[PDB]
């Protein structure tokens, strides 16, 4: 019953040289790491070493051209870096961005390998920059490479190609890159909960709507849970897991669970506008541990209130270590019931448990 943890100072080197107060702060990971220390959770975890992902490992999900542009950014001058960063949707680049993204991916490869070989039962990855917005051919939303998507492909590469991986994305923003990478894939089930607002919330695409169920062989293996009309919180995420996430995940019977654990849906986040409490994230973590014989990897994504994400991820690590879930504090808002009902009707054809 061992819980793994990976963290490396070197992932702080990715920074915004023009906007030092940019919300994707280097201190995001150190604040989460520091909160684990003062809560005495760090000494109960097994430290997993970080490492750089290889370019061949990046090719599992990303085109060679995209890898080369970011690899070339390591030697650019400040003026070249600003022009290149501005060519993407919400991306800043420094000379250390490429190495930090390599470390974030490679840190998750070691964690998945530790889980899949039984060295640890579950693991948490405090990494940056995030990954779930990165597409096959371009960077997006502070993400350069899709760390969660790469880890799923890496997990299959060290087991079997058809290894069933469930990716739960509870980051408040839709993982557009993760959806597109596995859109035609039946071996990687993608479930995302996200603020939608009829496509007005970032990343501002109708690909995040409930009717996108996957394509080809992947039909039914892409579950979007979009929220519309107002500040969502614990009761809405509790209901979505009870009605949609947990029934679909159990029928899928995953062999590995990856959590794109963004904490920008948390109370107090300056970007999400939601009110999910640290206890809420703990209960969601506890429910996912009932899958894949407890083989759960928590990967940091978004989340930009330093105090909120520190408490929230530490609560998740507390669940992986076996602690009992803390008790929650409300009737579902009408629009939330409407959203859950739309997903149920869209995915009932594919999941008899619905
Ligand atoms: O457009 C917005 O609503 C603000 C920026 C979006 C935040 C994204 S870029 C964070 C990725 S987890
Ligand atoms: K999401
Ligand atoms: K899929
Ligand atoms: Zn986000």
User: How many beta strands in the DSSP annotation?
Assistant: 8
Shape: globular
- The CA-CA distance between the termini, in Å, is 33 Å
Our Rg estimate from Cα atoms comes to 19 Å
Helix and strand pattern: EHEHHHHEHEHEEHEHEHH
Q: What is the CATH homology-level superfamily?
A: Histone deacetylase domain
Identify the strand order in the major beta sheet.
2-1-3-8-7-4-5-6
Oligomer: monomer
Which molecules other than protein and nucleic acid are bound?
Answer: dihydrolipoic acid, potassium ion, zinc ion
Main location: other
Protein name: Protein deacetylase HDAC6
Family: Belongs to the histone deacetylase family. HD type 2 subfamily.
Subcellular location: Cell projection, Axon; Cell projection, Dendrite; Cytoplasm, Cytoskeleton, Cilium basal body; Cytoplasm, Cytoskeleton, Microtubule organizing center, Centrosome
Question: Helices and strands in order, then pairings?
Answer:
Elements: E1 3-6, H1 27-38, E2 46-47, H2 55-58, H3 64-72, H4 78-86, H5 97-116, E3 122-125, H6 147-157, E4 165-169, H7 176-181, E5 188-195, E6 222-227, H8 234-252, E7 256-261, H9 278-288, E8 296-300, H10 306-320, H11 334-347
Parallel strand pairs: 1-2, 1-3, 3-8, 4-5, 4-7, 5-6, 7-8
Bound molecules: dihydrolipoic acid, potassium ion (K) (2 copies) and zinc ion (ZN).
């Amino acid at each position: 019953p061992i819980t793994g943890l990976v963290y490396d100072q070197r992932m702080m080197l990715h920074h915004n040289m023009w906007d030092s107060h940019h919300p994707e702060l280097p201190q995001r990971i150190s604040r989460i790491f520091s909160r684990h220390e003062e809560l005495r959770l760090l000494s109960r975890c097994h430290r997993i070493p970080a490492r750089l992902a290889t370019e061949e490992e990046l090719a599992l999900c990303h085109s060679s051209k995209h890898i080369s542009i970011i690899k070339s950014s390591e030697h650019m001058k400040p003026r070249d870096l600003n022009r290149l960063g501005d060519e993407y949707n919400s991306i800043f680049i420094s000379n250390e961005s490429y190495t930090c993204a390599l470390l974030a991916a490679g840190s998750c490869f070691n964690s998945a390998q530790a889980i899949l070989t039984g060295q640890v039962r579950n693991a948490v990855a405090i990494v940056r920059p995030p990954g779930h917005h990165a597409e096959k051919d371009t960077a997006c939303g502070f993400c350069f490479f899709n760390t969660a998507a790469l880890t799923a492909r890496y997990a299959q590469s060290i087991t079997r190609e058809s290894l069933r991986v469930l990716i739960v994305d509870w980051d408040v923003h839709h993982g557009n890159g993760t959806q597109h990478i596995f859109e035609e894939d039946d071996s990687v089930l993608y479930i995302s909960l996200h603020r939608y607002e009829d496509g007005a919330f970032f990343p501002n695409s109708e690909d995040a709507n409930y009717d996108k169920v996957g394509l080809g062989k992947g039909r039914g293996y892409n579950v979007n849970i979009p929220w519309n009309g107002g500040k969502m919180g614990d009761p809405e995420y509790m209901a979505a897991f009870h009605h949609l996430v947990m029934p679909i995940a159990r029928e899928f019977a995953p062999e590995l669970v990856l959590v794109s654990a963004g904490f920008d849906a948390a109370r107090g986040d300056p970007l999400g506008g939601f009110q999910v409490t640290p206890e809420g994230y703990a209960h969601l973590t506890h429910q996912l541990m009932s899958l894949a014989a407890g083989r759960v990897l928590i990967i940091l994504e978004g989340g930009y209130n330093l105090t909120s994400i520190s408490e929230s991820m530490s609560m998740c690590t507390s669940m992986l270590l076996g602690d009992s879930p803390p008790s929650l504090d409300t009737p579902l808002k009408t629009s939330a019931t409407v959203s859950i009902n739309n997903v149920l009707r869209a995915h009932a054809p594919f999941w008899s448990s619905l």
